[PDB]
Amino acid sequence: DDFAYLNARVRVRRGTLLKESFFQEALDLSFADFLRLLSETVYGGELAGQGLPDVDRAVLRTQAKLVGDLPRLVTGEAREAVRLLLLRNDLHNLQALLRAKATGRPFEEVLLLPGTLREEVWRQAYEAQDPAGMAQVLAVPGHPLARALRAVLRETQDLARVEALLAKRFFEDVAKAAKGLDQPALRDYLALEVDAENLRTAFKLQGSGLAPDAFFLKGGRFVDRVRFARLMEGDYAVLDELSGTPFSGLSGVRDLKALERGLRCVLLKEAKKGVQDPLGVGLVLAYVKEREWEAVRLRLLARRAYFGLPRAQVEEEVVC
Amino acid sequence: MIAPMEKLVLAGPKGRAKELLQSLQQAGVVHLETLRPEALSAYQLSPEERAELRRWEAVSAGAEHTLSLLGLEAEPARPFPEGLEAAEKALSPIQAHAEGLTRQKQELEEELALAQAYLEPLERLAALAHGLDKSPFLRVIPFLLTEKELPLVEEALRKALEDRYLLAHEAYAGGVAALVVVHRKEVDQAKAALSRAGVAELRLPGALGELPLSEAARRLKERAEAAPRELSEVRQHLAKLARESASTLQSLWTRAQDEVARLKALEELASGRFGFALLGYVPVKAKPKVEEALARHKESVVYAFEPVDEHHEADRIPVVLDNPPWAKPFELLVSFLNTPKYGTFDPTPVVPVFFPFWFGMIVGDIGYALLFYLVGRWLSGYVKRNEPLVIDLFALKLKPQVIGKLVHILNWMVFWTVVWGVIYGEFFGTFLEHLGVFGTPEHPGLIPILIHRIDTAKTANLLILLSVAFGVVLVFFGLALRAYLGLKHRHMAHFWEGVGYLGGLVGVLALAASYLGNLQAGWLQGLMYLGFGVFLLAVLMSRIWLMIPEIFTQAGHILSHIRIYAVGAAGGILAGLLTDVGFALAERLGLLGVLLGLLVAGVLHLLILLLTTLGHMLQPIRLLWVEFFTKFGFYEENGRPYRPFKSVR
Amino acid sequence: GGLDRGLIAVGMGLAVGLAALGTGVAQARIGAAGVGAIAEDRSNFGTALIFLLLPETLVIFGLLIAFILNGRL
Amino acid sequence: GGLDRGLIAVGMGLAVGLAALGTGVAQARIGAAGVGAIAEDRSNFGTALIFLLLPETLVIFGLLIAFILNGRL
Amino acid sequence: GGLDRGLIAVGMGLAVGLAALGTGVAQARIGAAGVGAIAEDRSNFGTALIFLLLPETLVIFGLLIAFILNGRL
Amino acid sequence: GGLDRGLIAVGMGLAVGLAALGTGVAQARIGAAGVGAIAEDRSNFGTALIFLLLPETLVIFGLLIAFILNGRL
Amino acid sequence: GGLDRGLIAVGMGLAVGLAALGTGVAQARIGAAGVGAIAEDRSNFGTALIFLLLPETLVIFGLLIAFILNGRL
Amino acid sequence: GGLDRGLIAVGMGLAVGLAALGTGVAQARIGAAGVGAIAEDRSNFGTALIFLLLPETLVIFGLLIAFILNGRL
Amino acid sequence: GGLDRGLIAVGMGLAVGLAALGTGVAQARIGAAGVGAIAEDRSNFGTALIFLLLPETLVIFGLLIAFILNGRL
Amino acid sequence: GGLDRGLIAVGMGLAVGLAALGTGVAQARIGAAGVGAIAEDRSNFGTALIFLLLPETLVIFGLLIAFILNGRL
Amino acid sequence: GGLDRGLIAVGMGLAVGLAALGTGVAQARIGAAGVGAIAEDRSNFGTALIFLLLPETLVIFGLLIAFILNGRL
Amino acid sequence: GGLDRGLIAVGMGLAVGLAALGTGVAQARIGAAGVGAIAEDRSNFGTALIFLLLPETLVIFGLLIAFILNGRL
Amino acid sequence: GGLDRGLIAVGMGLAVGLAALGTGVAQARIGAAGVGAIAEDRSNFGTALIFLLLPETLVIFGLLIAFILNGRL
Amino acid sequence: GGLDRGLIAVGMGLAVGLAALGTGVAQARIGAAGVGAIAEDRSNFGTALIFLLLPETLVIFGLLIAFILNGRL
Prior knowledge:
Chains C, D, E, F, G, H, I, J, K, L, M, N: Residues 11-69 form the V-ATPase proteolipid subunit C-like domain. By secondary structure, chain B is of the alpha+beta class.
């Protein structure tokens, strides 16, 4: 449970990274050039063959190997803090399993993305005869996913109501848990994420007539219920009002694509500002977020070079 | 000890096997092995068998869900004596009635909640909308807002046409009763502007925000009026239906669970053309319980009750505790840790011997023991009533079986905890400080308080010596049993390690009793040298590089037994001091608030007992389960539980 | 007479106090983890108390030496 | 009293104070977790107190030893 | 009337001081958690007050012992 | 004169100093929590100030004991 | 007296120093939180210093007691 | 009598107390980790207790030295 | 003098040392947070130094007491 | 005699106690890591103890010093 | 002479030692953050060194009091 | 004589105790990291063991000094 | 020679030892962070060593004070 | 008298013990980081050793001071 032990290893791993020259040089290359350069880089350790499925699988495997080891090799409160960094994949896998069970599709069709829980647990959870049994199979000592599944289990059985309440409660519970530990940077990143998620949900539900309070999330500090209601009800100048907050560059934008790009840039900057705590969790956050951005950019450039999309449609996605 | 068991091998006609399994399941125990890899078929169920399993599983699920909806428990009962079709035809009506009643209750309750959610706002809105409920140009729009900050919305209202649609709080003192009525959509634009400047729209869900104001309010009030009677009738009907159908539902649940278990078991058999076979394990003493059932097989099946495997590679063999009546009620205190491997020893009998005596040595207060006896009386009466001890505060669901076992344990504890108390005075605390029935050479009484514990300077050496002696006995027995088990299982390395540990401990103890104790080491020098030599020889001849540090740790585990003396002395001294202070305050001081002094002494003693009894009870078992069981193995290899076949309810 | 009684009193006090501090130090973290687990599931209310009352042995194992000195005074 | 009546007080103080420090260090983290859990759900107040008020045993033992020494001097 | 009248004072001072240090080391975590919960919801102020003001029992006991010694002096 | 006065002085000094350290230890964490909560929502200052000014009872009691000792001197 | 003055000096030094350590312990965490909030928004620099200088009453009381003692020398 | 026995009693008390604090510090973290593992899976109580109760050897050896000293006096 | 002089020097050294420790304890966390904020944005250097130099008042308050005591030599 | 005995007793007690505290401090972290690893996989119970027992040399040396002192006493 | 000189020397040594401990405690975290910043951006070499060398004022003041006391003796 | 041997014994005991505490403080973290790395991969056992053993040179140096002093006795 | 020389030796030892403890406390965190940075890139060792060798000032100043005391005694 | 060499011994004991504690305090973190780096890439061990061997330069001075003090015995 010593952050120094984890942080030295994370410093070595972050030293094993791909430079911006790799992203710029592949930005005008064919799928075979992207394949050959990828194979020569450390990202091409497990690159088996050629083709977009191969590129995607290789990216997934390399990311799992070099970012999924974080919750292990560290215990105690160090583990309890570093576990609330890589939890979105677990949230997605649980949501996918819940939806598949609700509809009726086989449990062997889901993707089962590499997360923080156990793959055997994920497989066995589908066969649970009750949602409580599925939660118990997915239950961990301190998993926010398990806590939120218990919380939503007090609302409904395996239905769309449970599916939505689970996501809302998991986001709120992750916010609370991050606030419940004394890590300077984790609380800030979690709060900024909560605010960004609330704003993005308001933009996504634009004009849907839904109750802003019922769709709102709590935990952030760069938005409020009034601003959520304004943005949801179409007042696209509320995003112009939130100036001064860390998400201040998003003033005057009214499109979903531009809003997503802006929020991604802001969150990436905030996570890259965590490198100021070399003996805290901050270097771990920086390594995780930089790895995720590298994976996303690599997959986008490789898909562009494979399916022959034009250059101008992807260069704007490597802005940050 | 871990009961001996034998592999029953049996085979017969592929059709008769479906009833042979039923007979065995209705019989006693047999842990069925998977049996499939036997150079034969995996006995996969027929398509009609698979359909029968699905139907019975549906029956079980429906029975459980309907029982939960009615609120009844899932405890078993007498079986349901019906086929699949009859069981389905019985479960369907009850499920239908429960579903309908639950839907009706949800509807009535939700209607009541909705109507009461906006009663005063509805009254205020009905008051204000007395003349503009249905208008051609535009209709009045209500606004349920917070307290009278109505100027906040009036700012935007005055920015719009204030020449019409004035809004203010008229009634519904729970808040500001806002509403605006005007011609054209200028009122709607003003509503948007007031929303921007701070205002809310009173569009309640359903007919409240979707019907004409007055008629909708009247309908809401009528629903709120009529909902009580409907809710009462629904509740009465549901309760009566549950009371009528509980027994049938439980019977169906038991029958369904039994049948589904039988089918899923049938999926475990081995098979071939026209044939089925099994290879389950059964305890050697239980043989007539199987034999007196599987004798009447249709073909008079093989029923070859073949031997156990030896200790040689039989870690899959099931284990069960098999202890005499004296020791069984205490097996609860020992089952919570790892199960024995198969041929390794069972520590179950040691505990009833060595735990209660240690506890009695720990606590000696005669009055405290009498209090424990009274508490046991209460618990035993509750168990006698068969009503389970439910304590929701600590999440306690003590069933009568556990209550009885704990009562037996407590009685056997109280015996020694009173005997050792009377063997050391300290009655009711320190009652001898008011009347010395027990007494000693400082003020002689009716009987000798032998080995007085309060006087530290006298008996401390004796008590510490006795404690360390009992500890040496326990650790030596544990090491010996480890040696014997390592010899029996032909583990030469284990035998060497155990022998070396015992020899090294003997050598260290000899050198200790010579140097740190008395002089005259003539008869002990040879023993000390022998022990050290034995330790070295065993370490060399076993090559395990066994830690002399581990020998030291074993030595510490030996020495730790002084905790009994320590805890006992602390408890006795504290109780005696408290009783002395109480007696002084009551009689020696004032002598008219004797009631106050006795009450204070009682309260202090009760608080001390409540706050210390937990540790007092925990320490002996801690010593046992940390030292003896660790020495004798018994926290490795984990075993395999003896699950019998079926026979629920 | 002499300072024998006083120095014996100081020894007894030091033993009792240091033992109490050690028992508190252990019980702090043990009880915190136990409270968390019991909150997560109210069925571990047994194992939590069992593993939380175990550290209290140090207080008694100090009070023993304290009472021995009090007797020798 | 001479040195005895003096240093007996030093012993009593060094006992009670160190016992209080131990009880505080034990009760700190347990109280923090209890407040967190009670905020999480307003029903576990009993289960929180049944672990916050247990470490008072150390302070009770400290007071016992102190009163014994005071009686002895 | 030798040094005893002074050693008594030193004992009283050490007792009160260490008792206060313990109460503070408890109130630190207890009050931090209480402030967090009350900020989360202003309703829980009563539970926060109960938990934060409970550990004053140790300080009260320390003052009791100090007053006993002082009155003996 | 003698050494009684000096010993009483050292006792008073230790009492006040240790109580001050206890109050400071509590106030550190309490103040950090308050400076977070009020900065997040400026409405809660009226409670954060109370929860950061409650640990002053430690110094109040310490100074009471010191004043009693001085009055005895 | 020959030793009374020196013991008074030790008492005064201990009081002042322990108070300075307590104030330093509080001001570490409070100032850390403050130098965060005032970097996130420069309007917070009025609440930060108003909280960071609040605890110094501890050192003030310590110096008051020390001055009283050193006056009685 | 006097210092000749008092300065042996103090040494015994120091040995016992320091061993007790050492064991408490050793046991707090291991107890928390064990409680976590047992909560995650109730089949690890055997290894949890075996690792938790191991450091009592320190208190055992300390008590041995204390008893040897009490014999020497 | 010979008897009071040494104890006065001990008191002075204790006061100075404890005040320097308090100032270091405060300056560690406040100096670390300041370096972080200044690295994040070079427009906070003034607020860093105006926070970091603030608790250096504690060592000046201690060194004043030291000078007074040394003057009483 | 007189002081020549009690001082040797105090020396031995301090040596044993401080060695016990050192061993406890190391064992807390090593045992927590080992418990975590064994709960992750039961094939690490070799290198768990095979490292958790090595710090016992730091107490063996202290016990050796204690035995030498008791011999010379 | 004798006790006067010895106690003056002990006071001086303690003062210097404790001041140096304070300086080291501060420089630890300050230099950690500085090493991080200078690794992130080579332009932080000046600011990190300027922030880390600042807490040497504690050592300067401690050694000044030490030199004054050494001159006195 | 009187103190001429007992104080030397106390010096040896304090030396051994403090050097053992230092070597345990080192061994805690260096042992935890070793256990973690070995449990992750069994290929680093040799380097993990050499990184565990090296800081025991502190206790090896400390026991040499104590032996020298004892031989001088 | 004499008690004066003995106390002077105790003082010199205390000064050098406390200074070394302070320097160690700083070098701990500084070395850990520098190790991390040099692992990320060996190019920065010219900054890592140049930042970790700075804290030698504390021990060097302590050695200066100790040598001055040795000269005067 | 005999107190000369007796106190001269405790001086060197304090010096060596405190130096060993400091070197151990540094070596904990500066070795855990090196162990992590070596695990990530065995080629990091070369720099990790030079990182963990530097903190010996404080125990290698405490030994020198203890040697000088013993030489003057």
